[PDB]
């Protein structure tokens, strides 16, 4: 309503940036945590798809 | 100049909220999207377990192999 | 009507930022829960690869 | 692309798996299978087309490879390559895309996973929105998919499906259906700390759905019912837009565009919300010709 109630908001948007100055760090790290979890959980498939296949290859003398 | 400044301040304060009502709907978009990823992250945690335990018994059965 | 709406916008602007921090504060918290939640998935999907990699040769030579 | 269509699709990808020894033989072996050998050599065969960007000939080789595991009666090993045809035919004939994905669903139904099935019920509905434009068929796919998410407890991710089945039903004049979805979303939105400030966006769409031909006169009975639970959704001016719109509904129909002129400036409305107001703007001119 004047200069003083502006400087409420002027300090308040300064908090929102800061708060978000923390927030861009946390949202960044999980980016690279998943993009490396891509290679873990897809080698997990080709580790498991190769596995059974070798256990489809292990079903001998079953009779 | 004085009247103009007020006029300038009008198109200032108009685009001021129009920058910051604009910041709100992206603020609410991430909150819908982040919480939606929570149950994306929930299925992987539950899945990993069954992704491990059912899979895990097969390691115990290796003595049969 | 000029200095009125400057107030009447900065009244409703401060009616947004008192909410806009609010909603951005949970966003600063909701990620923190998920960073722990990926972290449970992280080492376990690291273990589940290592267990199967032990078991592959125990199904390859078998 | 990539050394002459990837060796002209590997010279038809090793002579189209022919000389498979009839692909059926019971003389020597009675307990063996060359069909299992025919899996990888014909799944690799489909893979070479995507290097050559021949998606039409790609999924045609996935489906028989998907038929091959169905011939070997391994269930899951067929399903994950039907979808590799369904992902293939999206940049191809979409009618072949949707039914191959539809054939992929019934394997996942009796498998034990509806999450995968509900993911493809919205993937088949993505095709109905973009290429084969048939909206009411996509309605039954979203409505089926949201039943799977509610069956698997994901009440948050159900809504992102369940909004669009209410979204497309709005312009298809199926309001009294869609007016319940926005109500049951918003009633289940105010109760949570997450989605609380999003909840006022839903009830504004919900009150907007009270404009069939009826209950614009009982708009007061709408908004008093919208007063009831969520404390005017803490009295956002988006609902105050409707409040001045109530007394607008009788007279001064030129102020309709004036009412949104002070709203489209402060918040750029989208093409959904534009048409829904414009169809009201057609009906409010019936009050104009009544005044004459």
């Amino acid at each position: 309503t004047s200069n003083r109630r502006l400087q409420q908001t002027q300090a308040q948007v300064d908090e929102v940036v800061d708060i978000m100055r923390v927030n861009v760090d946390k949202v960044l790290e999980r980016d690279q945590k998943l993009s490396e979890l891509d290679d873990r959980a897809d080698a997990l498939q080709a580790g498991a798809s190769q596995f059974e296949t070798s256990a489809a290859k292990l079903k001998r003398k079953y009779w | 100049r004085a009247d103009q400044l007020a006029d300038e301040s009008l198109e200032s304060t108009r685009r001021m909220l129009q920058l910051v009502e604009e910041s709100k709907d992206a603020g609410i978009r991430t909150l819908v999207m982040l919480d939606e990823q929570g149950e994306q992250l929930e299925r992987i945690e539950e899945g990993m377990d069954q992704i491990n335990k059912d899979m895990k018994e097969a390691e115990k059965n290796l003595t049969d192999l | 009507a000029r200095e009125n709406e400057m107030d009447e916008n900065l009244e409703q602007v401060s009616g947004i930022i008192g909410n806009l921090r609010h909603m951005a504060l949970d966003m600063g918290n909701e990620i923190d829960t998920q960073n722990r939640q990926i972290d449970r998935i992280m080492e376990k999907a690291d273990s589940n690869k290592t267990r199967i990699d032990e078991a592959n040769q125990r199904a390859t030579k078998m | 692309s990539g050394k002459e269509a990837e060796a002209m699709a590997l010279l038809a990808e090793a002579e189209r798996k022919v000389k498979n020894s009839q692909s059926f033989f019971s003389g020597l072996f009675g307990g063996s299978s060359k069909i299992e050998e025919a899996c990888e050599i014909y799944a690799r065969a489909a893979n070479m087309f995507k290097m050559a960007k021949n998606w039409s000939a790609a999924g045609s080789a996935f489906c028989q490879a998907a038929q091959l595991h169905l011939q070997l009666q391994s269930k899951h090993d067929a399903a994950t390559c039907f979808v590799d045809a369904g992902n293939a035919f999206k940049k191809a004939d979409p009618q072949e895309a949707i039914n191959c994905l539809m054939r992929a669903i019934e394997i996942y139904t009796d498998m034990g996973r509806f999450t995968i099935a509900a993911k493809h019920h919205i993937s088949i509905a993505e095709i109905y929105e973009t290429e084969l434009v048939d909206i009411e068929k996509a309605i039954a796919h979203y409505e089926q998919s949201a039943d799977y998410y509610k069956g698997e407890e994901s009440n948050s991710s159900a809504n992102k499906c369940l909004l669009k089945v209410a979204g497309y039903a709005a312009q298809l004049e199926q309001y009294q259906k869609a007016i319940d979805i926005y109500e049951q979303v918003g009633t289940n939105a105010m109760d949570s700390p997450l989605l609380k400030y999003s909840a006022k966006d839903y009830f504004f769409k919900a009150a907007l759905c009270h404009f069939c031909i009826d209950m614009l006169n009982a708009k007061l009975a709408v908004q008093k019912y919208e007063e009831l639970f969520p404390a005017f959704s803490d009295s956002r001016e988006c609902k105050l837009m409707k409040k001045l719109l109530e007394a607008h509904e009788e007279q001064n129909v030129d102020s309709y565009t004036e009412a949104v002129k002070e709203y489209d400036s402060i918040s750029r409305l989208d093409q959904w919300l534009t048409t829904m107001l414009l169809r009201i703007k057609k009906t409010i001119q019936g009050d104009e010709e009544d005044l004459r």
């Binding site: 978000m20 927030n23 059974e52 | 007020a6 899945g47 097969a58 | - | -």
Partner: protein, 62 residues
């Protein structure tokens, strides 16, 4: 003059502040969706490898 020239030249500092704030959300709301597809290609990728082990766990104990 000076009663608003002091004031309005400080209001421009507030809009210069929110412009720093505004580009950060749109980069963040880009980045969450930019992560929101990596979280999909894990999801059904896990749902693959659950079944390959589920097909394994019934066969291995035999």
């Amino acid at each position: 003059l000076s009663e608003i020239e002091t004031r309005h030249s400080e209001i421009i500092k507030l809009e210069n502040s929110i412009r720093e704030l505004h580009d950060m959300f749109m980069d963040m709301a880009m980045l969450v969706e930019s992560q929101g597809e990596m979280i999909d290609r894990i999801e059904y990728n896990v749902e693959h490898a659950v079944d390959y082990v589920e097909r394994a766990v019934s066969d291995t104990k035999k």
